Design a protein around this ligand. Structure first.
Ligand SMILES: O=C(/C=C/c1ccc(O)c(O)c1)N[C@@H](Cc1ccc(O)cc1)C(=O)NCCCOc1c(-c2ccc(O)c(O)c2)oc2cc(O)cc(O)c2c1=O
Ligand SMILES: *[C@@H]1O[C@H](CO)[C@@H](O)[C@H](O)[C@H]1NC(C)=O
Ligand SMILES: [Ca+2]
Ligand SMILES: [Cl-]
Length: 496
C-alpha cells in the first residue's frame, strides 16, 4: 500500500481538481505522459448530493448518495474510458474515496443527486447502495448533539458525525463489504490507488479491515500481486490525541505539517527563514518520508481556513508558490502531489473568503471543458499550475534526480539557500530582500546547463539563464531579489 505504482522514473501525482473524465483522458495523452507525470488524483467519482443553495459548491462531492460512478465529471463509461486511456500511456489514476460518511443529516430527502438516485437522510435510507439506519453510528456516538464536539476525545472523533455528516458504521462487515465492492469495482476498472478521505474520522482497524477485502491491481496493466497505493487524509498538526502514526499499517498519510511549515518559512512568519530548511523532514516533526504524501496546498486548504490556515501558499501567491513547489519537488522527502486548480471570485471579508464554496467553472451547473491555449496554459478559468513551466520542469527535475542523496547544502544564515541531489541536479533559492551572487559547489559534471525555471533546453540551446559548471563542480549563480522567479534549477537532462 506504500508504493504509488507509477512507472519507474515518474515521481509525482497531480490533483486535477473537479476536472471532467474526458478532459483528464485527453490530458493524460497530450501532456501528462510526455511531460513525465506519474498519475492523477481525481475528484470523488461516486454519486453525490446536488446542492443548489449555494449553487453547486465543490464540497457537494464529499456528500455521497451512492456508489454509482455518475457525477458532474462524467458517467461510468466515461470514467472507464479515462482510466483505460491514461493507463495505456503509463499515467495512473488515484480515486478520492469518500467512505467515512454519506451526506449531511439535514439534507432534504428526494432525488437531488448527480445520478437521480433517491435518498432520505432523515430516515437513514440510501436505497441505491443500499444502506439503512442499521448502517450508521447513531447508537454508538455518545455526544449530546450526535456530532463531533471535542477533538480531545478520540472516540467521538471516529464514532460521531463530522459536522453533521451521517457516519457509517465501519465496524460492520456489511458496511465494510459495500465499501469494498465500490473500491474493487474501481480497482478492476484499472485504478492504481486511493486517497482515503477523512481518515482521522475512521478507526485504523476499520480501515485495515476494508483494505483486507481489496483486490490486487488489474493484471492487464500491473504486475501480479500489486497492491493499491493508499494515502490516508489524516489532518494531524499536533496537539490532539489522534496521531497519523496510528495509520501507518494501512498506507501512507497526508503530511499537512509540510505545507503549513513550508508556507510559514517562505512567508518568513515568526522569524522563520529558509536557512532553517537544512534539516527539513523528520527533524521538523514530520512522519517518516516513506509514509508521507506531501504537497504545498490541497483543495480544502487553498481556500485559507483548512489545515495551516493563512500560512498555506496557493496559485494566488504565484511567485512564492512556484518557489515552494520547487523546493518540495527538489527535496527528497515524501511522495509529491502537485495541485491543479480553478479560479473563483475570492472575496475576503473580515479575513475570510465568502466565495470559498464556489464550484468549478460551469455553464448552468455543467462543468466547462479545459481548453488549451497556444502558449500551453489553460482557458475557461482553469489555472493549470501543472502546466506552468516552473512547476512542470520541477516535476521533471524530481524524475531526473530520483534516488540521489540530499547534498551540497549552502545557506547565508538568512533566506539564500542551495542544495544538490547527488550528481544529477542542483537548485538555488533567493528569498531575501537583496541579491544572491555567489559561486557554489554544485556536485555536477562540468558543462553548460539550462536553468529550467527561467527557460528550457530546446534544440540544443537554452531559452533562459545558462549556468556554467567548472571542472571542480563550482558554478556562479546570480539571482536578483527582483527576478520573475528568484530560484534557479539545473539537472543532468538540462545539460547542453
Ligand atoms: O468546507 C467544507 C468541506 C471541506 C472539506 C471537504 C473534503 C475534505 O477532504 C476536507 O478536508 C475538507 N464544507 C463546508 C460546508 C459544510 C458541508 C457539510 C457539512 O456537513 C457541514 C458544512 C463547511 O463549512 N464545513 C465545515 C468545515 C470543514 O469541515 C469539514 C472537514 C474537516 C475539516 C478539518 C478537519 O480537521 C477535519 O477533520 C475535517 O472535512 C470534511 C470531509 C468531507 O468528506 C466532507 C465535508 O463536508 C467535510 C467538512 O465539512
Ligand atoms: C543554438 O543557437 C545558436 C544561436 O542562435 C544557433 O546558431 C545554433 O544553431 C543553435 N543550435 C545548436 C544545436 O547549436
Ligand atoms: Ca466515522
Ligand atoms: Cl488531501
Amino acid at each position: 500500500q506504500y508504493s504509488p505504482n507509477t512507472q519507474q522514473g515518474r515521481t509525482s501525482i497531480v490533483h486535477l481538481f473537479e476536472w471532467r473524465w474526458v478532459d483528464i483522458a485527453l490530458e493524460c495523452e497530450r501532456y501528462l505522459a510526455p511531460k513525465g507525470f506519474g498519475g492523477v488524483q481525481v475528484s470523488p467519482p461516486n454519486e453525490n448530493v446536488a446542492i443548489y443553495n449555494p449553487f453547486r459548491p465543490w464540497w457537494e462531492r464529499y456528500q455521497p448518495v451512492s456508489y454509482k460512478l455518475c457525477t458532474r465529471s462524467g458517467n461510468e463509461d466515461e470514467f472507464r474510458n479515462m482510466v483505460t486511456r491514461c493507463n495505456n500511456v503509463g499515467v495512473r489514476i488515484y480515486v478520492d474515496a469518500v467512505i467515512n460518511h454519506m451526506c449531511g443529516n439535514a439534507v432534504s430527502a428526494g432525488t437531488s443527486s448527480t445520478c437521480g438516485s433517491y435518498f432520505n437522510p432523515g430516515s437513514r435510507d440510501f436505497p441505491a447502495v443500499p444502506y439503512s439506519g442499521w448502517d450508521f453510528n447513531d447508537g454508538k456516538c455518545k455526544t449530546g448533539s450526535g456530532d463531533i464536539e471535542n477533538y480531545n476525545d478520540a472516540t467521538q472523533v471516529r464514532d460521531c458525525r463530522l459536522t453533521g455528516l451521517l457516519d457509517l458504521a465501519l465496524e460492520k462487515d456489511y458496511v465494510r463489504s459495500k465499501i469494498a465492492e465500490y473500491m474493487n469495482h474501481l480497482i478492476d476498472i484499472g485504478v492504481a490507488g486511493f486517497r482515503l478521505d477523512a481518515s482521522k474520522h475512521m478507526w485504523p482497524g476499520d480501515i485495515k479491515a476494508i483494505l483486507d477485502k481489496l483486490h490486487n491491481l488489474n493484471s492487464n496493466w500491473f504486475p501480479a500481486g500489486s497492491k493499491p497505493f493508499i494515502y490516508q487524509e489524516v489532518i494531524d498538526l499536533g496537539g490532539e490525541p489522534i496521531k497519523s502514526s496510528d495509520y501507518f499499517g494501512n498506507g501512507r498519510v497526508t503530511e499537512f505539517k509540510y505545507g503549513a511549515k513550508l508556507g510559514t518559512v517562505i512567508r518568513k512568519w515568526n522569524g522563520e527563514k529558509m536557512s532553517y530548511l537544512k534539516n527539513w523532514g523528520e527533524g521538523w516533526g514530520f512522519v517518516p518520508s516513506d509514509r508521507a504524501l506531501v504537497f504545498v496546498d490541497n483543495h480544502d486548504n487553498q481556500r485559507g481556513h483548512g489545515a495551516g490556515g493563512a500560512s498555506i501558499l496557493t496559485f494566488w501567491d504565484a511567485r512564492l508558490y512556484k518557489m515552494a513547489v520547487g523546493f518540495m519537488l527538489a527535496h527528497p522527502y515524501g511522495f509529491t502531489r502537485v495541485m491543479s486548480s480553478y479560479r473563483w471570485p475570492r472575496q475576503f471579508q473580515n479575513g475570510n473568503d465568502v466565495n470559498d464554496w464556489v464550484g468549478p467553472p460551469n455553464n448552468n451547473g455543467v462543468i466547462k471543458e479545459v481548453t488549451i491555449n497556444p502558449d500551453t496554459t489553460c482557458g475557461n478559468d482553469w489555472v493549470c499550475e501543472h502546466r506552468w513551466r516552473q512547476i512542470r520542469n520541477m516535476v521533471i527535475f524530481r524524475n531526473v534526480v530520483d534516488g540521489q542523496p540530499f547534498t551540497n547544502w549552502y545557506d547565508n544564515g538568512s533566506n539564500q539557500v542551495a542544495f544538490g541531489r547527488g550528481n544529477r541536479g542542483f537548485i538555488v533559492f533567493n528569498n531575501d530582500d537583496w541579491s544572491f551572487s555567489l559561486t557554489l559547489q554544485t556536485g555536477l559534471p562540468a558543462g553548460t546547463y539550462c536553468d529550467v525555471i527561467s527557460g528550457d533546453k530546446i534544440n540544443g540551446n537554452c531559452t533562459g539563464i545558462k549556468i556554467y559548471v567548472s571542472d571542480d563542480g563550482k558554478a556562479h549563480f546570480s539571482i536578483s531579489n527582483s527576478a520573475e522567479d528568484p530560484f534557479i534549477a539545473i539537472h543532468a537532462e538540462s545539460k547542453l
